Design a protein around this ligand. Structure first.
Ligand code: HEM
Length: 388
């Protein structure tokens, strides 16, 4: 019943997913799409921002293009944007995501990670690493990214949690949306009067009169949606991967270059997103061996692409010591993950700190079943009991 691109077995793409061709037509459930699994063909699809569109459309209706109405729920979602509109928004947001600016967040990330590790120690072992650490680190970090006032963060995160809660429907969902929107209206008004030092403040100081309040409010929701599940998934899965490959933990207790090498290897090997935004062909183009017809959709399996032998040899193995390779876990092209550096940093800090606090960290029950996080937009672990 579940679609083929969502299928996993342990840390790996499922055999069924691995058996599919480089580029074939599949049926979801009922929709019909192209599934691209090869590294080459995924890069060809993702590097093409002029013959493919990512803008969600309704009824089938103009495919790509400029100045089409966009529903509230998608304003400020860069992934739903085509150039030239994508190009505008990305350029406005880019200056907040450099290596230099993201490097400045290091002390705060260390603080957040330390506060969470403290909770674990206070709770005592055995402890659930997911609930106390993995699910708890990303929110505050994204707050800092945005420049949500330090003292507003607890209420901000709860309002946000309810709004992005897929389990809610009807009035409870609508009210969660209304409430969060109430805070973000206040936040944008605060920023319009005295621009802060995070992302929202940066944008109003430089481009104030040309950017809208809706856009700034949308940017806030969409950053939270883009940067939470992926990080919590990586922390959970990455810890399990390292614990089950204990010899490779030593790469997180050496110098920074080696811990950076371990992080990007874990990102490739675990590949938490199942797929980037579906692409719709605007005009006919050849991808790999096949003609993809206008109006047809393409879905890229990022995990399989990151197991392609053309990317690296011994690709189904975890090896933290190796040089970084041009994997597609963050995607490729103009939509290439805007938070890439932040993700890399966040994760490096969290892994390093965890083993610094708990050198002899172990699985509470290594012979028990693993509760994987299923039916979400990002693979992960929902519960992971640990001792120290
Ligand atoms: C390891 C964790 C992460 C992974 C694996 C990941 C992966 C990806 C991928 C594959 C895309 C491409 C989507 C597409 O082309 O359709 C993307 C886009 C994006 N990511 Fe991430 N991401 C991660 C963490 C983050 C974080 C921490 C942020 C910060 C908020 C973030 C913000 C974004 C944004 C804003 C985009 C849209 C960029 C655009 O469309 O131009 N991501 N990410």
């Amino acid at each position: 019943r579940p679609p083929i691109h969502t299928l996993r077995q342990g840390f790996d793409p499922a055999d069924e997913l691995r058996a599919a061709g480089e580029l074939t037509r599949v049926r979801l459930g009922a929709e019909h799409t192209w599934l691209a699994t090869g590294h080459d063909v995924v890069r060809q699809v993702l590097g093409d921002h002029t013959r493919f569109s990512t803008r969600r459309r309704f009824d089938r209706d103009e495919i790509g293009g400029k100045g089409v109405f966009r529903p509230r729920e998608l304003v400020g979602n860069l992934m739903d944007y085509d150039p030239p509109e994508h190009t505008r928004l990305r350029r406005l947001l880019a200056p907040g995501f450099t290596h230099r600016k993201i490097r400045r967040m290091a002390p705060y990330i260390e603080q957040i990670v330390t506060e969470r590790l403290d909770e674990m120690e206070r709770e005592g072992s055995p402890a659930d690493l997911i609930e106390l650490f993995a699910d708890e680190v990303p929110g505050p970090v994204l707050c800092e990214l945005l420049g949500v006032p330090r003292d507003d963060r607890a209420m901000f995160l709860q309002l946000c949690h309810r709004h992005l809660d897929a389990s809610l429907s009807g009035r409870r969902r609508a009210a969660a949306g209304e409430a969060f929107s109430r805070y973000l209206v206040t936040m944008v008004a605060r920023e319009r009067k005295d621009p802060g030092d995070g992302l929202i403040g940066m944008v109003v100081a430089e481009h104030g009169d040309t950017v809208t309040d809706e856009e700034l409010r949308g940017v806030c929701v969409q950053m939270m949606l883009a940067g939470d599940d992926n990080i919590s998934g990586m922390i959970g899965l990455g810890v399990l991967a390292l614990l089950r490959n204990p010899e490779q933990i030593a790469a997180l207790r050496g110098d920074v270059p080696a811990a950076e090498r371990a992080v990007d290897e874990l990102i490739r090997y675990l590949t938490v997103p199942y797929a980037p935004t579906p692409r719709t062909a605007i005009e006919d183009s050849t991808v790999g061996d096949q003609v993809i017809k206008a109006g047809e959709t393409v879905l890229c399996s990022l995990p399989t692409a990151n197991r392609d032998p053309a990317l690296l040899p011994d690709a189904d193995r975890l090896d933290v010591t190796r040089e970084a390779v041009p994997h597609v876990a963050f995607g490729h092209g103009v939509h290439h993950c805007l938070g890439a550096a932040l993700a890399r940093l966040e994760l490096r800090i969290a892994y390093t700190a965890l083993w610094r606090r708990f050198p002899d960290l172990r699985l509470a029950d290594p012979d028990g079943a693993t509760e994987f996080r299923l039916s979400t937009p990002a693979y992960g672990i929902s519960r992971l009991m640990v001792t120290w």
